[PDB]
Design an enzyme around this catalytic site. Sequence first.
Site, PDB file in Angstrom:
ATOM      1  N   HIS A   3      -1.778  -5.616   3.851  1.00  0.00           N
ATOM      2  CA  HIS A   3      -3.068  -5.950   4.535  1.00  0.00           C
ATOM      3  C   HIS A   3      -4.279  -5.928   3.582  1.00  0.00           C
ATOM      4  O   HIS A   3      -5.397  -6.143   4.040  1.00  0.00           O
ATOM      5  CB  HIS A   3      -3.412  -5.055   5.731  1.00  0.00           C
ATOM      6  CG  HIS A   3      -2.238  -4.673   6.573  1.00  0.00           C
ATOM      7  ND1 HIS A   3      -1.852  -5.392   7.685  1.00  0.00           N
ATOM      8  CD2 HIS A   3      -1.380  -3.628   6.483  1.00  0.00           C
ATOM      9  CE1 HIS A   3      -0.788  -4.825   8.223  1.00  0.00           C
ATOM     10  NE2 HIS A   3      -0.485  -3.751   7.515  1.00  0.00           N
ATOM     11  N   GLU A  54       0.839  -1.190   0.000  1.00  0.00           N
ATOM     12  CA  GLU A  54       0.000   0.000   0.000  1.00  0.00           C
ATOM     13  C   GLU A  54       0.874   1.239   0.000  1.00  0.00           C
ATOM     14  O   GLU A  54       0.610   2.157  -0.759  1.00  0.00           O
ATOM     15  CB  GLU A  54      -0.951   0.021   1.185  1.00  0.00           C
ATOM     16  CG  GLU A  54      -1.856  -1.198   1.301  1.00  0.00           C
ATOM     17  CD  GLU A  54      -1.169  -2.400   1.945  1.00  0.00           C
ATOM     18  OE1 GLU A  54      -0.210  -2.882   1.320  1.00  0.00           O
ATOM     19  OE2 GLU A  54      -1.573  -2.869   3.046  1.00  0.00           O
ATOM     20  N   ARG A  60      -5.255 -13.617  13.615  1.00  0.00           N
ATOM     21  CA  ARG A  60      -5.167 -13.439  15.037  1.00  0.00           C
ATOM     22  C   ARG A  60      -6.522 -13.248  15.681  1.00  0.00           C
ATOM     23  O   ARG A  60      -7.439 -12.742  15.052  1.00  0.00           O
ATOM     24  CB  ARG A  60      -4.357 -12.195  15.271  1.00  0.00           C
ATOM     25  CG  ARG A  60      -4.114 -11.881  16.687  1.00  0.00           C
ATOM     26  CD  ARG A  60      -3.119 -10.758  16.808  1.00  0.00           C
ATOM     27  NE  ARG A  60      -2.770 -10.534  18.210  1.00  0.00           N
ATOM     28  CZ  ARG A  60      -2.316  -9.397  18.703  1.00  0.00           C
ATOM     29  NH1 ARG A  60      -2.133  -8.321  17.935  1.00  0.00           N
ATOM     30  NH2 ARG A  60      -2.050  -9.339  19.980  1.00  0.00           N
ATOM     31  N   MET A 117      -6.436  -0.144  18.531  1.00  0.00           N
ATOM     32  CA  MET A 117      -6.739   1.108  19.219  1.00  0.00           C
ATOM     33  C   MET A 117      -5.495   1.943  19.457  1.00  0.00           C
ATOM     34  O   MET A 117      -5.604   3.149  19.734  1.00  0.00           O
ATOM     35  CB  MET A 117      -7.447   0.857  20.553  1.00  0.00           C
ATOM     36  CG  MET A 117      -8.926   0.604  20.418  1.00  0.00           C
ATOM     37  SD  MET A 117      -9.678  -0.078  21.897  1.00  0.00           S
ATOM     38  CE  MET A 117     -11.340  -0.376  21.328  1.00  0.00           C
TER      39      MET A 117
HETATM   40  C1  LIG Z   1       1.750  -7.076  12.960  1.00  0.00           C
HETATM   41  O1  LIG Z   1       2.491  -7.459  14.146  1.00  0.00           O
HETATM   42  C2  LIG Z   1       2.100  -6.797  15.411  1.00  0.00           C
HETATM   43  O2  LIG Z   1       1.053  -6.146  15.453  1.00  0.00           O
HETATM   44  C3  LIG Z   1       2.984  -6.901  16.622  1.00  0.00           C
HETATM   45  C4  LIG Z   1       4.041  -7.963  16.305  1.00  0.00           C
HETATM   46  C5  LIG Z   1       4.942  -8.363  17.484  1.00  0.00           C
HETATM   47  C6  LIG Z   1       4.557  -9.400  18.345  1.00  0.00           C
HETATM   48  C7  LIG Z   1       5.354  -9.803  19.422  1.00  0.00           C
HETATM   49  C8  LIG Z   1       6.577  -9.168  19.639  1.00  0.00           C
HETATM   50  C9  LIG Z   1       6.987  -8.127  18.777  1.00  0.00           C
HETATM   51  C10 LIG Z   1       6.176  -7.730  17.699  1.00  0.00           C
HETATM   52  N1  LIG Z   1       2.318  -7.234  17.876  1.00  0.00           N
HETATM   53  C11 LIG Z   1       1.301  -6.555  18.431  1.00  0.00           C
HETATM   54  O3  LIG Z   1       0.535  -5.820  17.849  1.00  0.00           O
HETATM   55  C12 LIG Z   1       1.181  -6.577  19.930  1.00  0.00           C
HETATM   56  N2  LIG Z   1      -0.216  -6.409  20.195  1.00  0.00           N
HETATM   57  C13 LIG Z   1       1.688  -7.880  20.555  1.00  0.00           C
HETATM   58  C14 LIG Z   1       1.252  -8.050  21.984  1.00  0.00           C
HETATM   59  O4  LIG Z   1       0.446  -7.215  22.488  1.00  0.00           O
HETATM   60  O5  LIG Z   1       1.724  -9.050  22.585  1.00  0.00           O
END
Ligand SMILES: COC(=O)[C@H](Cc1ccccc1)NC(=O)[C@@H](N)CC(=O)O
Lengths: 255, 227
Positions: A90, A68, A113, A123
């Site tokens: 995405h 994007e 997820r 958020m």
């Molecule tokens: C797209 O990937 C994400 O959004 C990242 C990726 C990530 C996960 C774990 C460690 C480092 C980075 N993670 C998140 O958004 C977080 N929400 C992860 C968490 O709250 O445990």
Amino acid sequence: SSHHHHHHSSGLVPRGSHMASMSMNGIRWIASYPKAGNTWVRCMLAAYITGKAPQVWNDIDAESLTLEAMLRFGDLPPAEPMEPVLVKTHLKADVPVLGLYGEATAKVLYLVRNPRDMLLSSMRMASISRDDVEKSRDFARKFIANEGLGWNGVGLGSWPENVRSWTESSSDRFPNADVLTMRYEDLKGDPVARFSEIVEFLDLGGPVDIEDIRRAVAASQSLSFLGEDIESDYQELLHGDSGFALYAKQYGYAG
Amino acid sequence: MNGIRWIASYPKAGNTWVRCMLAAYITLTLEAMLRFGDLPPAEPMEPVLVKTHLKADVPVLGLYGEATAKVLYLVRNPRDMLLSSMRMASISRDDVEKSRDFARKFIANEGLGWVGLGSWPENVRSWTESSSDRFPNADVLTMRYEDLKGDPVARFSEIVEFLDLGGPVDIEDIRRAVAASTLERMREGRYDQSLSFLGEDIESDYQELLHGDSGFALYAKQYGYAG
Ligand SMILES: COC(=O)[C@H](Cc1ccccc1)NC(=O)[C@@H](N)CC(=O)O
């Protein structure tokens, strides 16, 4: 003083080969909804191929590395690629642009997820503290209403739309392509096992080095507190044979 | 006739205004679309107006050589663009601090792209030397925003006729368009075209850009922005 992308080139000259003396080409989409794994896999991938993970401070940084962001400036990945091209996005599998990579696409990694988590982690994209409950509700309310984050026949789409597009992609939109699907929670549970599977699956050439992967790794919820009606309304989404629900139960995010 | 019509200009250099007065007459933005993964049709029944700031030679616009009927390029004294951009970056021009930074990065880059917009001259060349390879079916009209402001009636006339959107064009119908397109906008610095007010060095350096060997200077002088 070197260019900030130098690590993407061997810089060896003249160039030589391991395949000849004297892995399949095509696009590899790393695809997920926002906050649903594809930024982390996209960083790990850099670390593996390059040795050095990109600098991603926030969602703006992370968005730099997507199809994007590339599009906003009129660029495009190659459609007749002579090598493996990894592109994160995405976007829904069926948006017009990706029409151009029908023959081109070799591999689809789709990551999903738990939408509870996606919802909260999202958020933070909209720059909301945990203390502006008011703002949170509005976001969540607008999320639950839309079954996802696409509020401003294309773009991200609802969660179930996004999921149905990539998971059903191989059959028609990407005929030469294999599709692998992996829940973020699984990745987070066993990241080395899992990312080694991804790297095998993405077929970048040669034996996966499990040490190469361990080093590449090292580099790297209830809605009641917002209000009864939030948790409540979200729970309607998980009930049904209708779509959000189907996917939520298949991926073990409903009960 | 049927095909794509690009309403192309640098940021804040015209195409929005014009895309407004065409809108008003009748009764698509390429980068916005593209961000959602949307593309204008490459095989169209209808005429298709599409506004873009991107330089003509970006890959994506390569999907459009055959599909392209007309190009309207809009051009504007850089000084004025530099200052409207400032306000786009949401900075008051009571705040010289940020304003200086901004102008300095503009001059350093001969435009607003710090692929993409390109420098200002890269953008002008792109669309003014583009029928040559990129869009060989198309007829190309360039126009200064100044003159448009100068004679909206007689200049917008030239436009609607040129794009050939709707059969024959009436001055009555036209009148109502420049009416709203300005009446709507109207609801929404040194007077000598100078940047001295941001400090001398700034003016000094823009001046150097205007009167050198660099292409910025070339296109400036040929359109009447070199004074
Ligand atoms: C797209 O990937 C994400 O959004 C990242 C990726 C990530 C996960 C774990 C460690 C480092 C980075 N993670 C998140 O958004 C977080 N929400 C992860 C968490 O709250 O445990």
